[PDB]
């Protein structure tokens, strides 16, 4: 503390970077998220606090489309999250322009994690206050899902959660048996887990932003049709 947690370039006496240790606290404080790799795809899901009913239908959505087959579910400081999503979109576009075809998810996650590490390495710039999952599917490489901490590195996840209640979500995620369940029931189950996570116990009403990618969508990461997934929300309510 004191003089060591002032700039990211200052190492702790024990050998730690306290700026990122505090940036992780913003992710821990912001709303939670969940992403599950189904048998033939990856299903996302994020609850979003409607801080006031003055807002329209779900805006500043935690889900983003960084590429044609790749989607990003982010939590934490949302402005820097959107800036990082723009960075990821630019990286995917550059890779498609240079090497053709579609950017593999592992390489995209590695590059964006390296960019985040570059931002947390120096002193003038500050570490990003956001953690996100990158999910994509392809016929060749199946379904992948990588999660990036505000300072850490991408890690392969069968199913991951980040935000306010990580352990509470992860317990039921590990309770759920993935790797053999189709993405439909996985949408139902991610909605169920999010509603199991507390929504109105001490906060306002929450909206359910759920994303899709898989062979059922032949790649092409898109937001699940909310009109037909309201019944999945109803099953989650029960």
């Amino acid at each position: 503390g004191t003089g060591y947690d002032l700039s990211a370039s200052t190492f702790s006496p024990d050998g730690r970077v306290f700026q990122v240790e505090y940036a992780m606290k913003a992710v821990e404080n912001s709303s939670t998220a969940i992403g599950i790799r189904c048998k033939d795809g990856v299903v996302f899901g994020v609850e979003k606090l409607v801080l006031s009913k003055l807002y329209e239908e779900g805006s500043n959505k935690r889900l983003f489309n960084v590429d044609r087959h790749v989607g990003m579910a982010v939590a934490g400081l949302l402005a820097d999250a959107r800036s990082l999503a723009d960075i990821a979109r630019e990286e995917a576009s550059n890779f498609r322009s240079n090497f053709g075809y579609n950017i593999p998810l592992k390489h995209l996650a590695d590059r964006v994690a390296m960019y985040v590490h570059a931002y947390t390495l120096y002193s003038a710039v500050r570490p990003f206050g956001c953690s996100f999952m990158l999910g994509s599917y392809s016929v060749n490489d199946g379904a992948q899902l990588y999660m990036i901490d505000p300072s850490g590195v991408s890690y392969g996840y069968w199913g991951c959660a980040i935000g306010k209640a990580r352990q509470a979500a992860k317990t039921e995620i590990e309770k759920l048996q993935m790797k053999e369940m189709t993405c439909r029931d996985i949408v139902k189950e991610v909605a169920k887990i999010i509603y199991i996570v507390h929504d109105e116990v001490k906060d306002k009403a929450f909206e359910l932003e759920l994303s899709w990618v898989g062979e059922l969508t032949n790649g092409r990461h898109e937001i699940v049709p909310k009109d037909i997934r309201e019944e999945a929300e109803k099953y989650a309510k029960e």
Partner: protein, 237 residues
Amino acid sequence: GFDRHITIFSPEGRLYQVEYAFKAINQGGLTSVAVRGKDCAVIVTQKKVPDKLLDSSTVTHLFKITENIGCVMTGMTADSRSQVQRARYEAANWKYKYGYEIPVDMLCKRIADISQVYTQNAEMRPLGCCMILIGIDEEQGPQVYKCDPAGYYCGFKATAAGVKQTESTSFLEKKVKKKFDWTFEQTVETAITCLSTVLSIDFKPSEIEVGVVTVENPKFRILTEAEIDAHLVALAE
């Protein structure tokens, strides 16, 4: 003051920032062992996987920088990946500028020079990750080197990095003092028993990931579950 806050020389005549980064390598809870043998060099590190929701396929700390050089990383994972990317870029750039493949010692020297530039100046900070890189070199046999956050690139025969690196180095010093060369069965077994004596869990053949570079067979073989299980069975016999 700010002697211990920025990369500046202390009044006592020391550099505290890199001294803190070296302990940052200890932070993270991991260990690695590198053993050079009569003809091969093997490196093994534990694979600490919390919960199975992670993909054990990609949680590794060892990588292929080029077709013949493999590294193992100890410390913070972000800086580790950044230095791995830098090493791969350096190897590719050397192969482009010079036709022959980059010697492992030269790659370690370049990485250590980059780290020394990092500990120089004050805008940036040193990367808290210690890299042990191995590779077969003609007219030199197996070669193992370590580049640290300071920039001191050295290390040979038996060298370890991580939290309990001192105990592993002591046991490997005892082993190398015992004058007998290790073939491509004894080197791997020596590394495995070193890491097992450091952290006594009997090493179920899923929590470690060993990289091997031999002379008759080049390339950085990331030995699979079957190979590590066979080596463990042979050792515990």
